[PDB]
Write a protein that binds this ligand. Structure first.
Ligand SMILES: CCCCCCCCCCCCCCCCCC(=O)OC[C@H](COP(=O)([O-])OCC[N+](C)(C)C)OC(=O)CCCCCCCCCCCCCCCCC
Ligand SMILES: CCCCCCCCCCCCCCCCCC(=O)OC[C@H](COP(=O)([O-])OCC[N+](C)(C)C)OC(=O)CCCCCCCCCCCCCCCCC
Ligand SMILES: CCCCCCCCCCCCCCCCCC(=O)OC[C@H](COP(=O)([O-])OCC[N+](C)(C)C)OC(=O)CCCCCCCCCCCCCCCCC
Lengths: 58, 58
């Protein structure tokens, strides 16, 4: 009976639509590619650099 | 008998209509906040809450 309140309700339904269609796909997509992140490459490079530095000559 | 001037009737009717239409101001504000939220965040933490002065040692 309050048209602007019903418009707020419509806005809430659109927000629910967006979140329902957004959160699951993003979550699964970023879970699938966990091992392809830049942090993994940085960690591997750091480990290799440490290994090379410890074993070397003057 | 109650014989109000038509000026007053027009003024009161337009006051009620303005009251009715003002209710959608919050609605459009919420729509433009959900939309363009990054812009609002930049505004809030650049003008109203300026960043700290110091810089990292590195
Ligand atoms: C990709 C191509 C195909 C798909 C395209 C996807 C859709 C894109 C466009 C969607 C527009 C929104 C849906 C409109 C459908 C018709 C609704 C209708 O008849 O109204 C009654 C309905 C509600 O009427 P109702 O009678 O059903 O229920 C309310 C009645 N009471 C309160 C008594 C319960 O209106 C709405 O809910 C929203 C109306 C919005 C205004 C209509 C035009 C919108 C155009 C889009 C841009 C708006 C911009 C606004 C800001 C200014 C920007 C400059
Ligand atoms: C300085 C601004 C220049 C750039 C232009 C800015 C345009 C902004 C448009 C978007 C915001 C609109 C907000 C008000 C909407 C009102 C809708 C309406 O119909 O009113 C409800 C009701 C009328 O309900 P209604 O249902 O009859 O609406 C139909 C109205 N007609 C017939 C006119 C199409 O009117 C009111 O009682 C409220 C009126 C509000 C607007 C009043 C404007 C004049 C007084 C304030 C401004 C004075 C300074 C102007 C600048 C001069 C500079 C020297
Ligand atoms: C910092 C953020 C603070 C956010 C706080 C948010 C709290 C909100 C709490 C809401 C509680 C519920 C209120 C219900 C009111 C119902 C009124 C009503 O009857 O409406 C019918 C009328 C119109 O009625 P009608 O004609 O559409 O239909 C009536 C329905 N029947 C016929 C069945 C009775 O609408 C209004 O009264 C609308 C005007 C009142 C509200 C205006 C608010 C304006 C605020 C603008 C934004 C400001 C933001 C801050 C800016 C700061 C700048 C520095």
């Amino acid at each position: 009976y309050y048209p602007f309140l019903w418009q707020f309700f419509i806005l809430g339904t659109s927000f629910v639509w967006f979140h329902v269609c957004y959160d699951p796909w993003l979550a699964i997509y970023q879970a699938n590619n966990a091992h392809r992140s830049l942090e993994t490459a940085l960690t591997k490079e750091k480990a290799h650099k440490k290994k090379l530095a410890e074993q070397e000559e003057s | 008998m109650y014989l109000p001037t038509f000026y007053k009737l027009f003024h009161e009717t337009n006051a009620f209509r303005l009251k009715r239409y003002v209710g959608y101001g919050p609605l459009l504000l919420t729509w433009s906040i959900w939309t363009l939220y990054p812009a609002l965040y930049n505004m809030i933490y650049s003008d109203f809450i300026p960043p700290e002065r110091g810089v990292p040692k590195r």
